[PDB]
């Protein structure tokens, strides 16, 4: 659950929405849809 990161999902929901951009930990590298079950 590390995301002390930049959002860098290469979805449109962080791209844009700044609600799940903030601390994600999405391991950058997130780039497919149904693997962005992220909401933070
Ligand atoms: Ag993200
Ligand atoms: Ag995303
Ligand atoms: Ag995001
Ligand atoms: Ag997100
Ligand atoms: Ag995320
Ligand atoms: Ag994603
Ligand atoms: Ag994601």
């Given at each position: 659950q590390n995301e002390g990161h930049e959002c860098q999902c290469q979805c449109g929901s962080c791209?844009?929405?700044?609600?799940?951009?903030?601390?994600?930990?999405?391991?950058?590298?997130?780039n497919s849809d149904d693997k962005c079950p992220c909401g933070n």
């Open positions: 791209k844009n929405n700044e609600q799940c951009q903030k601390s994600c930990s999405c391991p950058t590298g997130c």
